[PDB]
RNA sequence: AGCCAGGAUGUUGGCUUAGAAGCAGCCAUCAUUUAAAGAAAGCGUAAUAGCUCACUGGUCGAGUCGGCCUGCGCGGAAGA
């Protein structure tokens, strides 16, 4: 690694790659084409499923296109498919909204293997211990 | 269709005429063949040195309504170019001209008619100099 | 913070990693970056862990003066900026390499490896440790004795001696 | 206090012509150079210069620290001499130096020739840089400030004569 | 600058020195914090 | 006090969000990585930013910080 050369992260869902209405002319402008950011993305995105957040770095030089290497997704968006309601925050901690305990989201703290600055396989559980409290979801743990 | 190139507005503070050649070759996909070359720009525009005639036409300020007096300084190393232009500016002419020869083109009439090099003139249509 | 009640703390608490210390390394980190903690702490993921600490405590007056647990020749071993490192579990091998094959790649000065405890000496790195659990180094270590050490010379008179 | 207390140590060279209340230092380069003092009694002694107050002076120390300071830059003065450097920003700005008088061109309707002081010389490694060395810190500092003056750096495009140790604010126009 | 009866340091890089019989405020960050008299 | 270094990772935090990935914003401020790093100070984003602050290390080495009680002064303060 080095530091910073060129990279960002703006996206709404994997259910629909390279969105046209959303970001539009706001998905790379320094060596990033808009009709090419769907030939290197769905090259492995269609290898798991479509409908979940997929951020990623953007290694840029000066040779026509570019190169990227994404990783584990956010454990906050997984609360629309693996937890409860469709939304999230909205109603923070003013009235016990959804409720997730020790059991749920358990293995969701097991998906980020290499991407988890929580050496202690057990302690790394305290990290995501909040990726489901940004709206108030008491744990029945 | 063949293209002559005129670099207008040397009365103004401009970009590096080297860099100007890059932008013309790179972005317009056509070779540059300098015929004249500016000596100083803006408040320091002194005139243009003709590369092929080997002489220096001297710019006079504000005669843009008629044609100014044609005032030539013959040699490129003529110590009157130093006197008329200041030896400082005179050397930068000599320096740039060195680099120009290693990164540009000789005007070829055949390639011009083929639309593959442009004769580049530097001047100022307002000062009526270079036209 | 806190005075003596806190000073004494950083001492004994970490100086336990000296009495019962596996290996030992003293590396300054002038111009260190965060990757500094994204390395010895990253390699702690799928090949190490919370079994390693480099608590920069070169407070000398605290670190050095704070080592009554027999570590002589150290009244010198504690110069300028420092960042001691120690082990509790695991062997006393590898570790030296995490530094030797990192700081060697720029990564700030490496105190030229001033050496630390265990044998208790001075400066001039070694590496007879990381060769451990690489048993196959003890395998070919016999150089097939009869074989290889033979097929390398006793049969070099043909590909290098027929003139 | 402090800066005052701290000794000055006269390097291998400089003579130190301490005459009562008039000190003079000469060495390597720098045509000597000498200043005066007041409420600070300075003592040569051995291989240094000590600075202290004087009875009946509330200025003591305060006048002594500036003492140290000055002398300390007087040693190094003739020793390593003193640096400088300025760089002209803006299309059409050009320095020259064709003697000991610098000839600047800054978009005015005229040139601006500026004659260097006593023991100060300068060179123009580039048509847009000026490095002027000297042994008197107090004068290079000036000559620099003075050159710069002709055309300080405006906060919009940044054009003008800046140092290098600058910062140049620079901000946007009033929106539409 | 601004001459007020009460100077006051506003910013963190705003200084306060006394050049002559006058207390002034020298704020290195924002010029608007430059003040005299006080 | 200078001077020398770091200030992230879960996280682009979700959210009335056209787009917000710490900072016009809402509600929240918890947990690792560590010597220290706040979903956090400021400049300023089309938006990331680049780049600097609390706090920890290093260098230097004796004092340093701010309130309280008192004495004497400074500005505030322009006229025929």
PDB file of N, CA and C in Angstrom, chain C residues 90-140:
ATOM      1  N   UNK C  90       3.350 -18.750  21.906  1.00  0.00           N
ATOM      2  CA  UNK C  90       4.109 -19.101  20.719  1.00  0.00           C
ATOM      3  C   UNK C  90       5.596 -19.241  20.982  1.00  0.00           C
ATOM      4  N   UNK C  91       6.352 -19.552  19.935  1.00  0.00           N
ATOM      5  CA  UNK C  91       7.795 -19.723  20.053  1.00  0.00           C
ATOM      6  C   UNK C  91       8.523 -18.386  20.150  1.00  0.00           C
ATOM      7  N   UNK C  92       9.849 -18.436  20.045  1.00  0.00           N
ATOM      8  CA  UNK C  92      10.684 -17.243  20.106  1.00  0.00           C
ATOM      9  C   UNK C  92      11.418 -17.093  18.782  1.00  0.00           C
ATOM     10  N   UNK C  93      10.759 -17.517  17.708  1.00  0.00           N
ATOM     11  CA  UNK C  93      11.329 -17.444  16.371  1.00  0.00           C
ATOM     12  C   UNK C  93      10.732 -16.280  15.590  1.00  0.00           C
ATOM     13  N   UNK C  94      10.041 -16.608  14.500  1.00  0.00           N
ATOM     14  CA  UNK C  94       9.402 -15.627  13.624  1.00  0.00           C
ATOM     15  C   UNK C  94       9.697 -14.167  13.967  1.00  0.00           C
ATOM     16  N   UNK C  95       8.896 -13.621  14.880  1.00  0.00           N
ATOM     17  CA  UNK C  95       8.981 -12.233  15.343  1.00  0.00           C
ATOM     18  C   UNK C  95      10.117 -11.354  14.834  1.00  0.00           C
ATOM     19  N   UNK C  96      11.360 -11.806  14.968  1.00  0.00           N
ATOM     20  CA  UNK C  96      12.481 -11.013  14.479  1.00  0.00           C
ATOM     21  C   UNK C  96      12.303 -10.675  13.002  1.00  0.00           C
ATOM     22  N   UNK C  97      11.747 -11.616  12.244  1.00  0.00           N
ATOM     23  CA  UNK C  97      11.523 -11.427  10.813  1.00  0.00           C
ATOM     24  C   UNK C  97      10.445 -10.397  10.481  1.00  0.00           C
ATOM     25  N   UNK C  98       9.418 -10.292  11.320  1.00  0.00           N
ATOM     26  CA  UNK C  98       8.362  -9.318  11.068  1.00  0.00           C
ATOM     27  C   UNK C  98       9.000  -7.943  10.932  1.00  0.00           C
ATOM     28  N   UNK C  99      10.105  -7.742  11.649  1.00  0.00           N
ATOM     29  CA  UNK C  99      10.849  -6.484  11.612  1.00  0.00           C
ATOM     30  C   UNK C  99      11.920  -6.537  10.521  1.00  0.00           C
ATOM     31  N   UNK C 100      12.739  -7.587  10.548  1.00  0.00           N
ATOM     32  CA  UNK C 100      13.816  -7.764   9.577  1.00  0.00           C
ATOM     33  C   UNK C 100      13.351  -7.707   8.124  1.00  0.00           C
ATOM     34  N   UNK C 101      12.162  -8.236   7.853  1.00  0.00           N
ATOM     35  CA  UNK C 101      11.621  -8.227   6.498  1.00  0.00           C
ATOM     36  C   UNK C 101      10.451  -7.254   6.370  1.00  0.00           C
ATOM     37  N   UNK C 102      10.657  -6.056   6.909  1.00  0.00           N
ATOM     38  CA  UNK C 102       9.676  -4.980   6.875  1.00  0.00           C
ATOM     39  C   UNK C 102      10.481  -3.691   6.870  1.00  0.00           C
ATOM     40  N   UNK C 103      11.130  -3.408   7.994  1.00  0.00           N
ATOM     41  CA  UNK C 103      11.957  -2.213   8.125  1.00  0.00           C
ATOM     42  C   UNK C 103      13.062  -2.204   7.063  1.00  0.00           C
ATOM     43  N   UNK C 104      13.433  -3.387   6.581  1.00  0.00           N
ATOM     44  CA  UNK C 104      14.463  -3.493   5.557  1.00  0.00           C
ATOM     45  C   UNK C 104      13.926  -2.833   4.296  1.00  0.00           C
ATOM     46  N   UNK C 105      12.601  -2.723   4.227  1.00  0.00           N
ATOM     47  CA  UNK C 105      11.911  -2.106   3.097  1.00  0.00           C
ATOM     48  C   UNK C 105      11.548  -0.672   3.479  1.00  0.00           C
ATOM     49  N   UNK C 106      12.563   0.135   3.785  1.00  0.00           N
ATOM     50  CA  UNK C 106      12.363   1.526   4.197  1.00  0.00           C
ATOM     51  C   UNK C 106      11.717   1.551   5.575  1.00  0.00           C
ATOM     52  N   UNK C 107      10.387   1.498   5.574  1.00  0.00           N
ATOM     53  CA  UNK C 107       9.572   1.510   6.779  1.00  0.00           C
ATOM     54  C   UNK C 107      10.266   2.120   7.998  1.00  0.00           C
ATOM     55  N   UNK C 108      10.847   3.302   7.816  1.00  0.00           N
ATOM     56  CA  UNK C 108      11.521   3.982   8.913  1.00  0.00           C
ATOM     57  C   UNK C 108      12.731   3.196   9.413  1.00  0.00           C
ATOM     58  N   UNK C 109      13.618   3.877  10.131  1.00  0.00           N
ATOM     59  CA  UNK C 109      14.811   3.249  10.686  1.00  0.00           C
ATOM     60  C   UNK C 109      14.385   2.017  11.479  1.00  0.00           C
ATOM     61  N   UNK C 110      15.311   1.087  11.677  1.00  0.00           N
ATOM     62  CA  UNK C 110      15.010  -0.128  12.420  1.00  0.00           C
ATOM     63  C   UNK C 110      15.987  -0.301  13.571  1.00  0.00           C
ATOM     64  N   UNK C 111      16.534   0.811  14.048  1.00  0.00           N
ATOM     65  CA  UNK C 111      17.498   0.777  15.140  1.00  0.00           C
ATOM     66  C   UNK C 111      18.625  -0.169  14.756  1.00  0.00           C
ATOM     67  N   UNK C 112      18.751  -0.420  13.454  1.00  0.00           N
ATOM     68  CA  UNK C 112      19.774  -1.315  12.920  1.00  0.00           C
ATOM     69  C   UNK C 112      19.795  -2.601  13.732  1.00  0.00           C
ATOM     70  N   UNK C 113      18.653  -2.910  14.340  1.00  0.00           N
ATOM     71  CA  UNK C 113      18.514  -4.095  15.170  1.00  0.00           C
ATOM     72  C   UNK C 113      19.611  -4.117  16.227  1.00  0.00           C
ATOM     73  N   UNK C 114      19.372  -3.364  17.296  1.00  0.00           N
ATOM     74  CA  UNK C 114      20.301  -3.248  18.410  1.00  0.00           C
ATOM     75  C   UNK C 114      20.285  -4.504  19.279  1.00  0.00           C
ATOM     76  N   UNK C 115      19.471  -5.483  18.891  1.00  0.00           N
ATOM     77  CA  UNK C 115      19.381  -6.713  19.657  1.00  0.00           C
ATOM     78  C   UNK C 115      18.804  -6.436  21.029  1.00  0.00           C
ATOM     79  N   UNK C 116      18.241  -7.453  21.668  1.00  0.00           N
ATOM     80  CA  UNK C 116      17.664  -7.249  22.986  1.00  0.00           C
ATOM     81  C   UNK C 116      18.049  -8.351  23.972  1.00  0.00           C
ATOM     82  N   UNK C 117      17.054  -8.902  24.663  1.00  0.00           N
ATOM     83  CA  UNK C 117      17.275  -9.948  25.661  1.00  0.00           C
ATOM     84  C   UNK C 117      17.307 -11.378  25.106  1.00  0.00           C
ATOM     85  N   UNK C 118      17.131 -12.345  26.007  1.00  0.00           N
ATOM     86  CA  UNK C 118      17.174 -13.783  25.720  1.00  0.00           C
ATOM     87  C   UNK C 118      18.646 -14.170  25.872  1.00  0.00           C
ATOM     88  N   UNK C 119      19.493 -13.901  24.861  1.00  0.00           N
ATOM     89  CA  UNK C 119      20.871 -14.304  25.138  1.00  0.00           C
ATOM     90  C   UNK C 119      21.502 -13.207  25.997  1.00  0.00           C
ATOM     91  N   UNK C 120      21.004 -11.983  25.813  1.00  0.00           N
ATOM     92  CA  UNK C 120      21.477 -10.803  26.535  1.00  0.00           C
ATOM     93  C   UNK C 120      22.850 -10.363  26.027  1.00  0.00           C
ATOM     94  N   UNK C 121      22.867  -9.516  24.996  1.00  0.00           N
ATOM     95  CA  UNK C 121      24.129  -9.044  24.425  1.00  0.00           C
ATOM     96  C   UNK C 121      24.096  -7.607  23.877  1.00  0.00           C
ATOM     97  N   UNK C 122      24.445  -7.439  22.598  1.00  0.00           N
ATOM     98  CA  UNK C 122      24.482  -6.113  21.967  1.00  0.00           C
ATOM     99  C   UNK C 122      23.802  -5.998  20.592  1.00  0.00           C
ATOM    100  N   UNK C 123      24.488  -5.359  19.639  1.00  0.00           N
ATOM    101  CA  UNK C 123      23.955  -5.144  18.289  1.00  0.00           C
ATOM    102  C   UNK C 123      24.627  -5.972  17.194  1.00  0.00           C
ATOM    103  N   UNK C 124      23.793  -6.543  16.318  1.00  0.00           N
ATOM    104  CA  UNK C 124      24.180  -7.381  15.171  1.00  0.00           C
ATOM    105  C   UNK C 124      23.213  -8.557  15.004  1.00  0.00           C
ATOM    106  N   UNK C 125      22.094  -8.289  14.333  1.00  0.00           N
ATOM    107  CA  UNK C 125      21.031  -9.267  14.087  1.00  0.00           C
ATOM    108  C   UNK C 125      21.436 -10.703  13.732  1.00  0.00           C
ATOM    109  N   UNK C 126      20.522 -11.628  14.018  1.00  0.00           N
ATOM    110  CA  UNK C 126      20.695 -13.044  13.731  1.00  0.00           C
ATOM    111  C   UNK C 126      19.416 -13.492  13.034  1.00  0.00           C
ATOM    112  N   UNK C 127      19.288 -14.790  12.791  1.00  0.00           N
ATOM    113  CA  UNK C 127      18.103 -15.319  12.125  1.00  0.00           C
ATOM    114  C   UNK C 127      18.014 -16.834  12.269  1.00  0.00           C
ATOM    115  N   UNK C 128      18.785 -17.389  13.202  1.00  0.00           N
ATOM    116  CA  UNK C 128      18.796 -18.831  13.442  1.00  0.00           C
ATOM    117  C   UNK C 128      17.514 -19.276  14.142  1.00  0.00           C
ATOM    118  N   UNK C 129      16.562 -18.353  14.265  1.00  0.00           N
ATOM    119  CA  UNK C 129      15.284 -18.633  14.918  1.00  0.00           C
ATOM    120  C   UNK C 129      14.125 -18.904  13.951  1.00  0.00           C
ATOM    121  N   UNK C 130      13.808 -17.940  13.066  1.00  0.00           N
ATOM    122  CA  UNK C 130      12.705 -18.122  12.115  1.00  0.00           C
ATOM    123  C   UNK C 130      12.792 -19.367  11.231  1.00  0.00           C
ATOM    124  N   UNK C 131      13.930 -20.051  11.271  1.00  0.00           N
ATOM    125  CA  UNK C 131      14.106 -21.260  10.477  1.00  0.00           C
ATOM    126  C   UNK C 131      13.320 -22.402  11.109  1.00  0.00           C
ATOM    127  N   UNK C 132      12.693 -22.124  12.251  1.00  0.00           N
ATOM    128  CA  UNK C 132      11.911 -23.128  12.970  1.00  0.00           C
ATOM    129  C   UNK C 132      10.571 -23.475  12.328  1.00  0.00           C
ATOM    130  N   UNK C 133      10.085 -24.673  12.641  1.00  0.00           N
ATOM    131  CA  UNK C 133       8.845 -25.198  12.084  1.00  0.00           C
ATOM    132  C   UNK C 133       8.882 -25.180  10.567  1.00  0.00           C
ATOM    133  N   UNK C 134      10.100 -25.058  10.053  1.00  0.00           N
ATOM    134  CA  UNK C 134      10.386 -25.092   8.628  1.00  0.00           C
ATOM    135  C   UNK C 134      11.279 -26.328   8.570  1.00  0.00           C
ATOM    136  N   UNK C 135      10.908 -27.316   9.386  1.00  0.00           N
ATOM    137  CA  UNK C 135      11.616 -28.587   9.527  1.00  0.00           C
ATOM    138  C   UNK C 135      12.299 -29.082   8.264  1.00  0.00           C
ATOM    139  N   UNK C 136      11.684 -28.843   7.108  1.00  0.00           N
ATOM    140  CA  UNK C 136      12.261 -29.279   5.841  1.00  0.00           C
ATOM    141  C   UNK C 136      13.646 -28.638   5.644  1.00  0.00           C
ATOM    142  N   UNK C 137      14.034 -27.773   6.581  1.00  0.00           N
ATOM    143  CA  UNK C 137      15.336 -27.109   6.553  1.00  0.00           C
ATOM    144  C   UNK C 137      16.285 -28.017   7.319  1.00  0.00           C
ATOM    145  N   UNK C 138      15.692 -28.935   8.074  1.00  0.00           N
ATOM    146  CA  UNK C 138      16.426 -29.916   8.856  1.00  0.00           C
ATOM    147  C   UNK C 138      16.400 -31.210   8.051  1.00  0.00           C
ATOM    148  N   UNK C 139      15.530 -31.241   7.042  1.00  0.00           N
ATOM    149  CA  UNK C 139      15.398 -32.394   6.153  1.00  0.00           C
ATOM    150  C   UNK C 139      16.571 -32.352   5.179  1.00  0.00           C
ATOM    151  N   UNK C 140      16.521 -31.422   4.227  1.00  0.00           N
ATOM    152  CA  UNK C 140      17.611 -31.282   3.268  1.00  0.00           C
ATOM    153  C   UNK C 140      18.880 -30.949   4.050  1.00  0.00           C
TER     154      UNK C 140
END
